[PDB]
Amino acid sequence: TAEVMSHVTAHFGKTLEECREESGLSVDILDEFKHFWSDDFDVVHRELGCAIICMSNKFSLMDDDVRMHHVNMDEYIKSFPNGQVLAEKMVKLIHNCEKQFDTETDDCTRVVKVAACFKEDSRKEGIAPEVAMVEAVIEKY
Ligand SMILES: CCC/C=C\C=C\CCCCCCCCC=O
Ligand SMILES: [Mg+2]
Ligand SMILES: [Mg+2]
Ligand SMILES: [Mg+2]
């Protein structure tokens, strides 16, 4: 649901600053990770894909194939309030998006394409949070 997705994003997003230098992700491409969800942010830069790899690996959310680690992702989503309602759904959406981009050989590019797909499918499924909802939870933890 959109509130669980707001907690997930608020917490995950706290690793963006430490990942900027190695990914090339300028503040002028993305200032705060919560903007990922804005109507006006296009999820397209290779550098954002490199950043997401950096951020994921902090939490062991990717496996050694630079794809989502399903078990660690399920445990991560369950770590938030009401996480059990989102965990299986989110893992399903991300992995369906992964399958569409398997043929992309550049890991950074692949990951940003998966991320755009995930944003799209989350919006479609009604679980995409608004930027304001993410901001409302930024203080936590
Ligand atoms: C690894 C998933 C990132 C964890 C939580 C989600 C945060 C909000 C949006 C980030 C999109 C991540 C797309 C997964 C990419 C997998 O190839
Ligand atoms: Mg840190
Ligand atoms: Mg680099
Ligand atoms: Mg790892």
Ligand SMILES: [Mg+2]
């Ligand atoms: Mg390349």
